[PDB]
Amino acid sequence: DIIIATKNGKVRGMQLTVFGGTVTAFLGIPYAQPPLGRLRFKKPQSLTKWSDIWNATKYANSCCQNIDQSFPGFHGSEMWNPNTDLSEDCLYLNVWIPAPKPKNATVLIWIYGGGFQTGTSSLHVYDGKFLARVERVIVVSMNYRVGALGFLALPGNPEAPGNMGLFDQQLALQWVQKNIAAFGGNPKSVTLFGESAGAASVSLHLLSPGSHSLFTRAILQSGSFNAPWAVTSLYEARNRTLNLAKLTGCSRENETEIIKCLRNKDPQEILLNEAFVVPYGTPLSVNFGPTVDGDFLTDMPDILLELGQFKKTQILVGVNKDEGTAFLVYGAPGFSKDNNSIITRKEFQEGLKIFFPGVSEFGKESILFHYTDWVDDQRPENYREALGDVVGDYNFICPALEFTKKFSEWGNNAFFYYFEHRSSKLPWPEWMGVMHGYEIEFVFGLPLERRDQYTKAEEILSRSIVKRWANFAKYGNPQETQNQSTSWPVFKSTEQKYLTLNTESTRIMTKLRAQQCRFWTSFFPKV
Amino acid sequence: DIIIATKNGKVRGMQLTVFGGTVTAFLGIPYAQPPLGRLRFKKPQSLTKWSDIWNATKYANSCCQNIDQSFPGFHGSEMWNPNTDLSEDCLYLNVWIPAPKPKNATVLIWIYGGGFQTGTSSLHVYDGKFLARVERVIVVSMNYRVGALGFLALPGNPEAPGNMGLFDQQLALQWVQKNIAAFGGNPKSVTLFGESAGAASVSLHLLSPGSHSLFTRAILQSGSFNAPWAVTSLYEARNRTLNLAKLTGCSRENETEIIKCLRNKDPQEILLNEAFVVPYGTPLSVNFGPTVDGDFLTDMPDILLELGQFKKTQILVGVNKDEGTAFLVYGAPGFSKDNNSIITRKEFQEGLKIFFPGVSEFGKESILFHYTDWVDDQRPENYREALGDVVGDYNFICPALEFTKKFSEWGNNAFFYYFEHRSSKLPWPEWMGVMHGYEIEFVFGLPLERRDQYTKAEEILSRSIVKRWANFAKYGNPQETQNQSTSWPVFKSTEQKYLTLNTESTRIMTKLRAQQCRFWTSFFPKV
Amino acid sequence: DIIIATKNGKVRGMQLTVFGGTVTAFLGIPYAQPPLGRLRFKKPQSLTKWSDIWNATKYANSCCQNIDQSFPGFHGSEMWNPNTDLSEDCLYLNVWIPAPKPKNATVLIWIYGGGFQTGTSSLHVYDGKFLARVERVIVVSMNYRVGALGFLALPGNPEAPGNMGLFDQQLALQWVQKNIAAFGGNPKSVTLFGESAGAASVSLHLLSPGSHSLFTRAILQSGSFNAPWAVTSLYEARNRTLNLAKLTGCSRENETEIIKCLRNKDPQEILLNEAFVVPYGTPLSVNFGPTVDGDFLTDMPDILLELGQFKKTQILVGVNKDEGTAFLVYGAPGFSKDNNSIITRKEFQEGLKIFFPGVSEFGKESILFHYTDWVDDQRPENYREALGDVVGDYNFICPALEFTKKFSEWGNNAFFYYFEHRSSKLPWPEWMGVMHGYEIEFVFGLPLERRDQYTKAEEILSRSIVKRWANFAKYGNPQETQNQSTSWPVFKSTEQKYLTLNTESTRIMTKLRAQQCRFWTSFFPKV
Ligand SMILES: *[C@@H]1O[C@H](CO[C@H]2O[C@@H](C)[C@@H](O)[C@@H](O)[C@@H]2O)[C@@H](O[C@@H]2O[C@H](CO)[C@@H](O)[C@H](O)[C@H]2NC(C)=O)[C@H](O)[C@H]1NC(C)=O
Ligand SMILES: *[C@@H]1O[C@H](CO[C@H]2O[C@@H](C)[C@@H](O)[C@@H](O)[C@@H]2O)[C@@H](O[C@@H]2O[C@H](CO)[C@@H](O)[C@H](O)[C@H]2NC(C)=O)[C@H](O)[C@H]1NC(C)=O
Ligand SMILES: *[C@@H]1O[C@H](CO[C@H]2O[C@@H](C)[C@@H](O)[C@@H](O)[C@@H]2O)[C@@H](O[C@@H]2O[C@H](CO)[C@@H](O)[C@H](O)[C@H]2NC(C)=O)[C@H](O)[C@H]1NC(C)=O
Ligand SMILES: *[C@H]1O[C@H](CO[C@H]2O[C@@H](C)[C@@H](O)[C@@H](O)[C@@H]2O)[C@@H](O[C@@H]2O[C@H](CO)[C@@H](O)[C@H](O)[C@H]2NC(C)=O)[C@H](O)[C@H]1NC(C)=O
Ligand SMILES: *[C@H]1O[C@H](CO[C@H]2O[C@@H](C)[C@@H](O)[C@@H](O)[C@@H]2O)[C@@H](O[C@@H]2O[C@H](CO)[C@@H](O)[C@H](O)[C@H]2NC(C)=O)[C@H](O)[C@H]1NC(C)=O
Ligand SMILES: *[C@H]1O[C@H](CO[C@H]2O[C@@H](C)[C@@H](O)[C@@H](O)[C@@H]2O)[C@@H](O[C@@H]2O[C@H](CO)[C@@H](O)[C@H](O)[C@H]2NC(C)=O)[C@H](O)[C@H]1NC(C)=O
Ligand SMILES: *[C@@H]1O[C@H](CO)[C@@H](O)[C@H](O)[C@H]1NC(C)=O
Ligand SMILES: *[C@@H]1O[C@H](CO)[C@@H](O)[C@H](O)[C@H]1NC(C)=O
Ligand SMILES: *[C@@H]1O[C@H](CO)[C@@H](O)[C@H](O)[C@H]1NC(C)=O
Ligand SMILES: *[C@@H]1O[C@H](CO)[C@@H](O)[C@H](O)[C@H]1NC(C)=O
Ligand SMILES: *[C@@H]1O[C@H](CO)[C@@H](O)[C@H](O)[C@H]1NC(C)=O
Ligand SMILES: *[C@@H]1O[C@H](CO)[C@@H](O)[C@H](O)[C@H]1NC(C)=O
Ligand SMILES: *[C@@H]1O[C@H](CO)[C@@H](O)[C@H](O)[C@H]1NC(C)=O
Ligand SMILES: *[C@@H]1O[C@H](CO)[C@@H](O)[C@H](O)[C@H]1NC(C)=O
Ligand SMILES: *[C@@H]1O[C@H](CO)[C@@H](O)[C@H](O)[C@H]1NC(C)=O
Ligand SMILES: *[C@@H]1O[C@H](CO)[C@@H](O)[C@H](O)[C@H]1NC(C)=O
Ligand SMILES: *[C@@H]1O[C@H](CO)[C@@H](O)[C@H](O)[C@H]1NC(C)=O
Ligand SMILES: *[C@@H]1O[C@H](CO)[C@@H](O)[C@H](O)[C@H]1NC(C)=O
Ligand SMILES: *[P@@](C)(=O)OCCCC
Ligand SMILES: *[P@@](C)(=O)OCCCC
Ligand SMILES: *[P@@](C)(=O)OCCCC
Ligand SMILES: [Cl-]
Ligand SMILES: [Cl-]
Ligand SMILES: [Cl-]
Ligand SMILES: [Cl-]
Ligand SMILES: [Cl-]
Ligand SMILES: [Cl-]
Ligand SMILES: [Cl-]
Ligand SMILES: [Cl-]
Ligand SMILES: [Cl-]
Ligand code: NA
Ligand code: NA
Ligand code: NA
Ligand code: NA
Ligand code: NA
Ligand code: NA
Ligand code: NA
Ligand code: NA
Ligand code: NA
Numbered sequence A, B, C: 001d002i003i004i005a006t007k008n009g010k011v012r013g014m015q016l017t018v019f020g021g022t023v024t025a026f027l028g029i030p031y032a033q034p035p036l037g038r039l040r041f042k043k044p045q046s047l048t049k050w051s052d053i054w055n056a057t058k059y060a061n062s063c064c065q066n067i068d069q070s071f072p073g074f075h076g077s078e079m080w081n082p083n084t085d086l087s088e089d090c091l092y093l094n095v096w097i098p099a100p101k102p103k104n105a106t107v108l109i110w111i112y113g114g115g116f117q118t119g120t121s122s123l124h125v126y127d128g129k130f131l132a133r134v135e136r137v138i139v140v141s142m143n144y145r146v147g148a149l150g151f152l153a154l155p156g157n158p159e160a161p162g163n164m165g166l167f168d169q170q171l172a173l174q175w176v177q178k179n180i181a182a183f184g185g186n187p188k189s190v191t192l193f194g195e196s197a198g199a200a201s202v203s204l205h206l207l208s209p210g211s212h213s214l215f216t217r218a219i220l221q222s223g224s225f226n227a228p229w230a231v232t233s234l235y236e237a238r239n240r241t242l243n244l245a246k247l248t249g250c251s252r253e254n255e256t257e258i259i260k261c262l263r264n265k266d267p268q269e270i271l272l273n274e275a276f277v278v279p280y281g282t283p284l285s286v287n288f289g290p291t292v293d294g295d296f297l298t299d300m301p302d303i304l305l306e307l308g309q310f311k312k313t314q315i316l317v318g319v320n321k322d323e324g325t326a327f328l329v330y331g332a333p334g335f336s337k338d339n340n341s342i343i344t345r346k347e348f349q350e351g352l353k354i355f356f357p358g359v360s361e362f363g364k365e366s367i368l369f370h371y372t373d374w375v376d377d378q379r380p381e382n383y384r385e386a387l388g389d390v391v392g393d394y395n396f397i398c399p400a401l402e403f404t405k406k407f408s409e410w411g412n413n414a415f416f417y418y419f420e421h422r423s424s425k426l427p428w429p430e431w432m433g434v435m436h437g438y439e440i441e442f443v444f445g446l447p448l449e450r451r452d453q454y455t456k457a458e459e460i461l462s463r464s465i466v467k468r469w470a471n472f473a474k475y476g477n478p479q480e481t482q483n484q485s486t487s488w489p490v491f492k493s494t495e496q497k498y499l500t501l502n503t504e505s506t507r508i509m510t511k512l513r514a515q516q517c518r519f520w521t522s523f524f525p526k527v
Helices: A129-135 A147-151 A164-183 A197-205 A234-247 A255-262 A267-274 A301-307 A345-355 A361-371 A382-408 A456-475 A514-526 B129-135 B147-151 B164-183 B197-205 B234-247 B255-262 B267-274 B301-307 B345-355 B361-371 B382-408 B456-475 B514-526 C129-135 C147-151 C164-183 C197-205 C234-247 C255-262 C267-274 C301-307 C345-355 C361-371 C382-408 C456-475 C514-526
Strands: A003-005 A010-012 A014-018 A021-030 A092-098 A105-111 A138-142 A185-195 A217-221 A315-320 A414-419 A497-501 A508-510 B003-005 B010-012 B014-018 B021-030 B092-098 B105-111 B138-142 B185-195 B217-221 B315-320 B414-419 B497-501 B508-510 C003-005 C010-012 C014-018 C021-030 C092-098 C105-111 C138-142 C185-195 C217-221 C315-320 C414-419 C497-501 C508-510
Touching: A003 A164, A010 A021, A014 A129, A021 A129, A092 A129, A092 A164, A105 A164, A105 A197, A105 A456, A129 A138, A129 A456, A138 A164, A147 A164, A147 A267, A164 A185, A164 A197, A185 A197, A185 A456, A197 A217, A217 A456, A234 A255, A234 A267, A301 A382, A301 B456, A315 A382, A345 A361, A345 A382, A361 A382, A361 A514, A382 A414, A382 A514, B003 B164, B010 B021, B014 B129, B021 B129, B092 B129, B092 B164, B105 B164, B105 B197, B105 B456, B129 B138, B129 B456, B138 B164, B147 B164, B147 B267, B164 B185, B164 B197, B185 B197, B185 B456, B197 B217, B217 B456, B234 B255, B234 B267, B301 B382, B301 C456, B315 B382, B345 B361, B345 B382, B361 B382, B361 B514, B382 B414, B382 B514, C003 C164, C010 C021, C014 C129, C021 C129, C092 C129, C092 C164, C105 C164, C105 C197, C105 C456, C129 C138, C129 C456, C138 C164, C147 C164, C147 C267, C164 C185, C164 C197, C185 C197, C185 C456, C197 C217, C217 C456, C234 C255, C234 C267, C301 C382, C315 C382, C345 C361, C345 C382, C361 C382, C361 C514, C382 C414, C382 C514
Parallel strands: A105 A138, A105 A185, A185 A217, A217 A315, A315 A414, A414 A497, B105 B138, B105 B185, B185 B217, B217 B315, B315 B414, B414 B497, C105 C138, C105 C185, C185 C217, C217 C315, C315 C414, C414 C497
Antiparallel strands: A003 A010, A014 A021, A021 A092, A092 A138, A497 A508, B003 B010, B014 B021, B021 B092, B092 B138, B497 B508, C003 C010, C014 C021, C021 C092, C092 C138, C497 C508
8 A cells, every 4th residue: 555645635556566576656646627617728727635545546537639530440540549538627647656665766757749639648658667667767647638628729818828738738747846756756857758749849848938947858759849730820820719619600709708608619519620620631730739829938939949048958859760651541642551552653742732732833843853863773662652751851850850950059968869660569561661659669668578579679679778768867868888888979960960779780870861851941941 | 908006006008009919008107206306416216106096198208408400390300309298307117018918028128319418218219019019028118317407417426426317217227127027027038228329328237237137138229338429527527517507607615505506497597508518519519428426337438348347248239321421410511401412622621620629630630531532533422421431430330349349358249230221211311321310210110010101121121120139139149030031140359240231132241340440449549 | 524333333534635635534443352461462352342433533553563773764764664652552454435435446455564573554655545536446454463472373272373463464354344335345346455574464365264255356566475484384483482481581381371471571571582582583584474373374375375275366466676685784794775785706605694594505505606697797786786686586576476377377367567667766775776665655656646756757657557456456457448558468377478567668578587486496495
């Protein structure tokens, strides 16, 4: 039996057996008042106080959200679907601690991805018990609101001010500040890490003044706020919010009245409409996301980044070799997971049309031009590979690299990785390569689990990443010092060294996707 | 309805419609006891406290001051004349805030020019509502005492200690420190900006110990305290103060008695005499200005500048291409606004006599020599252009450049601009070029106003300056980051880069008026 | 009438007319309990408190001390003799302030010389009223105990712990910290300056932990603690203290008993014996001076200097062209002030014998060797000039230069001057040149006094030093910025630039007395 007195009252956890030892898990600790009825669309408000012992012994409700139904029954997609009841009552967090209770452990806070429209901390691939067992770090994760219910904005007006999901996150980070020492945590040693939209969230916490003092350092996997799907403009945010009212027969006059009306709709009606607040989406649509609200975000992030207004600290940033592929089977013509997807020039052009709907003909010709001077053999897989690279480079790799350049020019240490190992257990087909999302299991140390059959090499690779992440968190420096590993150099502008993470040959390389990033970064934004 | 509780009690403002949105204006908030009767010539004293709601809904009294009557009915001069009642009761300030109320906005404090003899915050070209609407900054301006009533000095003696107008300013800056957060302001992010005498005031706040902690950074348009009209010596201050007594039949024995006597004169009698406390003025006379009082100013400013005694922070400094011209029609022979003013050598010499009255024959020959080796064609406009340059270089550009050299040698970032756009709406004739004072409307964003017919190019130029000023204020760096603009480099000694602001071609240049500034700066002061 | 409430109670000063204006002088303010009876030889103790108004309107008792009787009636010597009653009751200080009272003036604290055996703040050449009038600085000076009564040491034992005179000084510096703001002073801007033993005192305050926070910066004229007369060893201090007891029939058993006995002797008996506690003195004997007591001084000063244990701040250090001469007429054979003192080789050798009594024959041959390879003409004044240089170099110039090297190697700004003007009013004969002590009148601004007939050039030189000293005090940098003067560069090791102060040609020079200082500094200490 294990009970911890927090600032809001007692909580009980369970004992887990991990890897020959023990871990104490507190699942589903509330961190805010349930945001229901009159609190829907409003910033999270703080917890009442409680008599009795709270039983944090099972995962809590995931937040309301649409589910991916493109591959029903397929483990590749379904592993990302929520594994607990959906409810509006979803502001809870989990804590995993070493046994015996440590004395001043470094704290890792995970923020999940899902396009700001989906995700949940209770997923199998986010289970923190392994990191706690092996590295003696404490691992925290929280649920935050997604979709309209999390990011509906009607500018300035506090009935729906914008960024509610980011504030749920910020309020959980605070809960860590006030309570984590009771669990044996060191509030002065907190690293945020997250992937995709979770990684862009982490990048925004770096920019947010209310976040400055709620963490020490940061890890960004395949995401940053300068990615093109990450921040909704005020223009498009209003168009969307009013388009939603129209669809739910909530078009009114007085703005507060539109919110009051939307607060009377049932969650399902709002979920059902979210998809259509846009004339045409892509498989990369973020219908409701971060906006510049003058509160969490005080100006457009490009400006803040460029002029150096953000927390000075170390960052670890990285991406996967085939980020783009996973998106092509959600709309691109002649793509399937159940065949090799050898496509034609004509399919590719149509492809660009799906991914770049509001872009001029010339703009599209310009991508075709940059990505189809091969180099050279009349390889059939030419066009399929180029469409993956197009989507990866524009959406993930290039924005990640630029964020890293920009951040390090203000003087701080940064480390960049390029993950190129395809999991032996990957259920998607071989042509999709080293996919978006599939370094996570390596970071949480799933292949360490003996009775799960990853390879021996995967076990060793995982053991080595877990160590680098943990060393990063505790000491600002992601080295594996014992087993005579390849030293990971800092990323500077000019040299721009990165580290390759693979199962065979770990290498130091320079200037990842140089030619491609000149295209996305200097030419394409003018278009 | 909008009411803010301040430290002195409540105030009500009005709602303005600007550019499709709203701005809240509080006009005429008092910031000091009215300096009347026994408080005339004394440092401002602090506000009593008040029950009821103060109605800050119209501009307040401008301070007592003579008016320019050289061009009655001419919009070019009259636009600078005071647009509210003159009264001794004039220590008030205005606040403009974004709607919805922001959370921690950067604050811009404007200090007007007028030779320390004239000016008022209520002028059309100082209306802060545009900056507030477009940049979401808060804009403050205040009225401070000018002429004898603001700068009469009888050394050490506190009945008339000197610098009262500078202390009115300092006391308004304080009012910002104590109250601005109630308006949504961030007291820790205050930029002072001002033009001409207003710009020299800003430079003196940098030197004043009582000001150090009342602002963050500073913007100086066409003015600095090392300009030759900016600081009155103790010698000339006494001669003047006693000359005024003599003229008003206030010559006494006991010094306090002379003040007591002057405090019995009516404002108009003092105004009427101010002009003659000098044997001969120029169109650049500052009969009553800043002095070294051992209080606001603790030593002569040249020494403080040279030896590095001032606030360490970023500055933005600049000047206009034809600063000198506006002064030539206020006394220089054969100059008129109603004709081209082609003058002769003989007129030019007489001209120097008007502008450099107490200077030796040789001194005057030396200006003629430096400014009349052309380069070369027998152009008729030769002499007219040289007299403008003489007055500009000596009075504005050269002192501004030297102040910037001197300030940056102590390690801080500085930015220098050279404004060379002549407003399409300028009522003065073409030969007067890019005049003193006419970048102000661009900085306050008047050409942004659609229904006012500035050009489209002027709109775009203004939009770009407003952004650079605002970025400067918020982040210390005056870049326009979005529209791929010319980056503005820091001004260092040795390289001395500056930025040109025009409607066509924005450029990086080096060593503005190199030859001319060697003349004014190294040779002329010996004379 | 002018009354200031201090922490010990009220004081009244007088009004002085200086140079067309006014200065307020408080003469003889007590700063410690009178150190009489049972307090003789003990550290100074703090002031009781007082009702009534203290009348600080005349100079106070100078401390007990022997007088120079070598030239009775001669203004050259007698100007250094005490000009008030000698008494044991002598711990008082003077304050001079600008009129009108300033607001936050920089403070100059003067510490007089006199070999630690003589001196007094009430001397004519230490009158602070001129500095106060002209520079608007506040000037403080204090009386501190000298000779046995100030520096008697019987190690560790607190009845006579050592350094009492240094602690009198330290306690006056404290009095400045607690009280000077009431006079208009800024306690955070205090420069210590002093000459000879006063200059060595200043150098020891830099080393003393109890002094660290009682001043900002320091000026050393012809003195430093590494000079060879400056610090008595523990060995020689005991030998002396016991030799004094023996002479006064106070030889006892219990050490406290010897003090108790000496506290019963009358001041005159102690004064009369001080001279003989040494088998043989020189005209540079310091029979009772600073010692390493483990309290004011925590280790030998050479070590502290060399290893960088002292206050980090700016210093101004300098010396006079003929420091040595004044000492030759107090014992050196064939020297007189009443003739040219052309001496022989044989006289010179005897001379070395007077000045280096306990030094080996070889040691003496070594000085002769270094100082008598001329360069070359058979000039009669050869030997007379060399004996002056010998005494100057060893006692003043060389130790001053070494102190400056050593101090600047730890990173702080230092300025070095070489004063080479012989006063037109000097009563000593021409051959004695630019003597020890005769830059003081220039620093206090005596030649500024119109009705005193120094030359016009001397007036201008003085005006310029007063300004450099004052700029040093206020701003850390001794420049004269207005009258286009020679800029004074910092003294670094390697380059070692110094400034020459003379009436004609002010110059930047390098490596003063290079050859000579290698001799005194590297070879002579081994001997
Ligand atoms: C790979 O599959 C795609 C995708 O669509 C198909 O899925 C397959 C697994 C198959 O079972 C089939 O029934 C299904 O249509 C193929 O593209 C399609 O080609 C078909 C038939 O010619 C067209 O009707 C469609 O327009 C197009 N479908 C879509 C959804 O775009 C593709 O040809 C196939 N590629 C191969 C074998 O290389
Ligand atoms: C430009 O005008 C000046 C200024 O004075 C004149 O203003 C004009 C607009 C005109 O209407 C006229 O009545 C008025 O005098 C001229 O200089 C003047 O020249 C006049 C006539 O010869 C002399 O009497 C004056 O001394 C002198 N006036 C002043 C006030 O200095 C100037 O000649 C004219 N320049 C041109 C046409 O190039
Ligand atoms: C300069 O004077 C010295 C010092 O002593 C003398 O002082 C003089 C002013 C003079 O009035 C005289 O009476 C007095 O003795 C002279 O050295 C002295 O030489 C004398 C006479 O030969 C010797 O008896 C002494 O040993 C020696 N005196 C001392 C005190 O050392 C010196 O010769 C003279 N120098 C000249 C004229 O160049
Ligand atoms: C945002 O504003 C309008 C809103 O019109 C939308 O109504 C919503 C409730 C939703 O159902 C959505 O499908 C619909 O788009 C957008 O107008 C669209 O633009 C086209 C012209 O290209 C017109 O045909 C329609 O008005 C509408 N589209 C359709 C398919 O009916 C508008 O484009 C959008 N603004 C943007 C994206 O900047
Ligand atoms: C400051 O002191 C005197 C004051 O004389 C002045 O009296 C004033 C009240 C006012 O009316 C003003 O016009 C007048 O100047 C100055 O004396 C002037 O100097 C000239 C000699 O060049 C004499 O003729 C007069 O005393 C007087 N001028 C006139 C036109 O009558 C004095 O010059 C001034 N000091 C300065 C500027 O340094
Ligand atoms: C310190 O200790 C002795 C003390 O002897 C001294 O007695 C004093 C009271 C005083 O009168 C003083 O004149 C006398 O010196 C010193 O002894 C001296 O050394 C010489 C030998 O060179 C002997 O002749 C005497 O004992 C004495 N001198 C005289 C002239 O009588 C001792 O030298 C000294 N220690 C040092 C300087 O290190
Ligand atoms: C928490 O679980 C334990 C099981 O041992 C139980 O005793 C306790 O009542 C639980 N809390 C509840 C049911 O609210
Ligand atoms: C934990 O470590 C921090 C420094 O990182 C320290 O200041 C804090 O007091 C420690 N708390 C403990 C040991 O409980
Ligand atoms: C609209 O209604 C809201 C909510 O009831 C009210 O408080 C507000 O003042 C109204 N605003 C306008 C602009 O009519
Ligand atoms: C280091 O070495 C051993 C094998 O020699 C391995 O089992 C262990 O996992 C390694 N530790 C890390 C942190 O990689
Ligand atoms: C301020 O103006 C309002 C107008 O609505 C008024 O009600 C109030 O009395 C005013 N204050 C005055 C007149 O002092
Ligand atoms: C505003 O920002 C400053 C830092 O510039 C911060 O210290 C202050 O507390 C903030 N106040 C708010 C958010 O109200
Ligand atoms: C002159 O009168 C003033 C004001 O009444 C008085 O307080 C002051 O002491 C007097 N000064 C002189 C120098 O006569
Ligand atoms: C940037 O670009 C657009 C036009 O593409 C323009 O309307 C807007 O005013 C510009 N913003 C700034 C700050 O200049
Ligand atoms: C100080 O001097 C004044 C002279 O005006 C006198 O009134 C006062 O009594 C003096 N203090 C004394 C004598 O103790
Ligand atoms: C005097 O100046 C210091 C800084 O050198 C400042 O901290 C202090 O408060 C000032 N005191 C005054 C103006 O009374
Ligand atoms: C000597 O006498 C002193 C002073 O009376 C006394 O306090 C001390 O204990 C004695 N010391 C010795 C060593 O006899
Ligand atoms: C500077 O210049 C003037 C003479 O032109 C002189 O009288 C004054 O004393 C000088 N000031 C200083 C500080 O030397
Ligand atoms: P990640 C899976 O959170 O983001 C991809 C961006 C578009 C939805
Ligand atoms: P600005 C118009 O305040 O200053 C010009 C200087 C002389 C009056
Ligand atoms: P200053 C005259 O105090 O020192 C000379 C050193 C030996 C007495
Ligand atoms: Cl690759
Ligand atoms: Cl084609
Ligand atoms: Cl390379
Ligand atoms: Cl030009
Ligand atoms: Cl001529
Ligand atoms: Cl150049
Ligand atoms: Cl010399
Ligand atoms: Cl010999
Ligand atoms: Cl050299
Ligand atoms: Na995913
Ligand atoms: Na590995
Ligand atoms: Na590449
Ligand atoms: Na103007
Ligand atoms: Na532009
Ligand atoms: Na030029
Ligand atoms: Na002396
Ligand atoms: Na000089
Ligand atoms: Na030399």
